[PDB]
Symmetry: C4
Subunit: 180 residues, 4 copies
């Protein structure tokens, strides 16, 4: 295939993220050289999840995303049987040891409301906290409890807008936005 | 011998822990290839002690476990003659510079009460603080003063339950539980 | 050319700073072997900017100086469109996520008042915060809000006076002061 | 010469400390293979100074000891001309940016009172703060303002008593104590 978007992803995101995203796609029968926009979205979602877990204190967050499915669910079981929290029907992205709730992190190229709705009706599980970021700088969170302080969220939003500009400078943005 | 439990231990715990546990067993005339459940228990107890000492601040805890016997007692003497605390009759696991007391950490596959009792009657030394963790997520501590905040304890309990699941996924758990 | 000041700069500042300063000069058609005092000033300004951003918390400051022009402006756009702050007419040195303002850092061998005035009339942009340091230990900041606590500023001033003494011990100071 | 005390020093203290102590002795025309007790005392004083500066916050302390004489005085000049503090007649060990005073750290095998007196009458300079530690666990400080919190001081005292026991276990202590 040899797309521009594939080479941009490997040059824009750090190698641990790119490697984790490649594994994730191949685990579900997808190819980063063909599904290159999905490749870019998964790297972005990964980097946001990691920046998020760095926003708290040392021990605050348990990272669920970026693990293989079986180990991710194993950590979820341990957390649930240790804290008595309901076992979510779907894999969340993090666990907040301070607020004692699982977090599902969303990154969308749409209006946060339109994504939150879809991400909440399908969420079904009432317990898990939801937190959406947008490539335009909007964010929406359950009960408007945004977990982290403003500074850590602001850095996530700045990084997201930088990724947008880099894609636009290479004319890859419009194809990326129109392929959600 | 070549047991499954031995290979699981080396693949589940990090090499510094495995090495420290091997030394500890050989110092007391035990073989990790034969006493493989004891091998697993010592690695677990070691990892819990290290996670515990990381839960406090930078200078809070002095680590006693994981040293050879003579150096461990040497540090105890220095702590005692520096803080005036009673020299314990038995080797503790940590010293809390903030609360000024030695800590004995227990990890059991039984009810925390049954282990605490045995670990307290044999403790004899009235001064040292006791803190028990279980593979099911229960904890018991002297005066119910659990030293660390909830988040740091919760991580220890999550790790303990992950070790349990990994053993069970390999059918090693029932032999591990029935060999205390 | 082979000047003493060039060899002093490479021996006094750390290699990442020296390399960043060399790139910056060559990007604007200047040579560090000829414009050696400018070479020294840019390394100094760079080290001060980096020490400054280290004075805050983990996530407080976004570093703008030390990047190439296009990426520096890209980060500025992301910050502006994320926080709604006015896009400055000129490239600032940092962004404070806590106080939500861009910072322009000045390092002068003159009176802070004389430099602040020139650095403020040409600043034009009313929004960006200004913070001047001197090689004698004086500092001046917008509204006399010096952003960081005293200890972090004191370290910057101590380093600046050490650079002065080292230049004077090599008789390079008077040429450095008289070439602003 | 090949003394036991020399081999104990190299095996007990870390290589950066041993190297810094060797330079310090040779700068003043002393040999670590002959003045082996002085060798041990300088390594001890160095390790205490470094542990002390680690007890505060990130930016709190400027380290003066362990530098060559000319650079140590250069940092002192910068600190003095930056904070307006009196230039001490003698080289101190640290500068506290939080309390804005130089610290002279003492490590003695005598009574802290007997050492403090001698270390204060010869200090002459009224401004610099004095802080003495003993190999028995006593400490004395100017105005009984001990700068650091109890935990950080307790660790210094524990290390000092460990060095004592190690020397005694090798029958080197009595020669060390009787050679102040
Ligand atoms: C391929 O089918 C599935 C895969 C997975 C799950 C469920 C799946 O369906 C049965 C759970 C887990 N999904 C997430 O972790 C997750 N998913 C999303 C969005 C909306 C929901 C589906 N989705 C995808 O992207 C699916 S594709 C994909 C996802 C992750 C890695 C690689 C690929 Cl290829 N958004 C997130 O913010 C988020 O964290 C992995
Ligand atoms: C082999 O005899 C002894 C060995 C040791 C001590 C005393 C011993 O008896 C004379 C002190 C010290 N023990 C502990 O540090 C410690 N011990 C335990 C449990 C209950 C009490 C005995 N025990 C064991 O596991 C003994 S075997 C063993 C222990 C540690 C490493 C390697 C091996 Cl092989 N539980 C802990 O939580 C704990 O910290 C080492
Ligand atoms: C070469 O022209 C220009 C270059 C640049 C800018 C603007 C320029 O004019 C069109 C923006 C940016 N300047 C700064 O970031 C900056 N500049 C200064 C001082 C007063 C204003 C001009 N200046 C210089 O030093 C110019 S030369 C120079 C500067 C930086 C690196 C290398 C060189 Cl060679 N003082 C700072 O504290 C400070 O942060 C780069
Ligand atoms: C060799 O002459 C001198 C050397 C030096 C100074 C002054 C000297 O006299 C002219 C300043 C500086 N001294 C200290 O920094 C310092 N000195 C001491 C004790 C009591 C005062 C003298 N002293 C020594 O140990 C001297 S020998 C020595 C010292 C340090 C390294 C190597 C050697 Cl060989 N105690 C400390 O706690 C302390 O910090 C270096
Ligand atoms: Mn996910
Ligand atoms: Mn997600
Ligand atoms: Mn123990
Ligand atoms: Mn124990
Ligand atoms: Mn600049
Ligand atoms: Mn500047
Ligand atoms: Mn000294
Ligand atoms: Mn001293």
């Amino acid at each position: 295939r040899g797309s521009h978007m594939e080479d941009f992803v490997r040059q824009c995101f750090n190698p641990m993220i790119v490697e984790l995203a490649e594994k994730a796609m191949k685990e579900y029968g997808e190819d980063p050289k063909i599904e290159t926009n999905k490749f870019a979205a998964i790297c972005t979602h990964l980097e946001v999840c990691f920046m998020y877990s760095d926003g708290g204190s040392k021990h605050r967050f348990e990272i669920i995303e970026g693990r293989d499915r079986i180990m991710a669910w194993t950590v979820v079981n341990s957390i649930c049987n240790t804290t008595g929290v309901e076992k979510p029907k779907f894999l969340p992205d993090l666990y907040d040891y301070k607020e004692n709730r699982f977090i599902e992190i969303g990154v969308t190229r749409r209006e946060v409301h339109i994504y939150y709705l879809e991400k909440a009706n399908k969420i079904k599980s009432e317990k898990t906290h939801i937190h959406i970021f947008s490539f335009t700088g909007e964010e929406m969170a359950t009960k408007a409890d945004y977990t982290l302080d403003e500074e850590s969220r602001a850095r996530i939003k700045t990084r997201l807008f930088t990724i947008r500009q880099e894609m636009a400078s290479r004319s890859l943005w419009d194809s990326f936005r129109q392929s959600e």
